[PDB]
Amino acid sequence: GGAFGKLEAAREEEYFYRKQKEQLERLKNDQIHQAEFHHQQIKEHEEAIQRHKKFLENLTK
Amino acid sequence: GGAFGKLEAAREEEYFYRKQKEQLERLKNDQIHQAEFHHQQIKEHEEAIQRHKKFLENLTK
Numbered sequence: 001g002g003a004f005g006k007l008e009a010a011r012e013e014e015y016f017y018r019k020q021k022e023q024l025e026r027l028k029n030d031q032i033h034q035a036e037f038h039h040q041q042i043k044e045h046e047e048a049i050q051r052h053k054k055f056l057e058n059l060t061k
Numbered sequence: 062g063g064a065f066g067k068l069e070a071a072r073e074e075e076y077f078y079r080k081q082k083e084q085l086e087r088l089k090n091d092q093i094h095q096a097e098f099h100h101q102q103i104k105e106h107e108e109a110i111q112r113h114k115k116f117l118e119n120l121t122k
Contacts, residue, residue: 017078042110
């Protein structure tokens with residue numbers, strides 16, 4: 001498709017969700033403890049916000 | 062299990078990711094435009110950060 005367009009946006013969401021599902025499984029199998037899980041998930045959601053701002057600023061002007 | 066424990070954490074992630082897959086589908090089917098998608102997704106990730114902070118606070122001290 002195009003840069004920062006609908007197909008790229010979908011691909012980024014798919015990558016993000018695949019990663020987070022893998023982390024949820026590490027938690028369910030006691031490979032990471034829960035405090036660590038929540039601390040790492042905050043950083044992921046912070047990076048997701050920056051990614052969405054980036055897409056937005058390219059879409060809008 | 063227990064409140065704020067591993068099973069509840071998993072349930073919160075499952076709910077969050079089911080909602081986001083629904084929103085991604087709305088975008089794929091041009092029911093929301095892309096700027097709106099990214100703007101709404103920032104709010105969702107902001108709410109997820111607050112949720113993860115709340116779980117952490119209960120886990121730790």
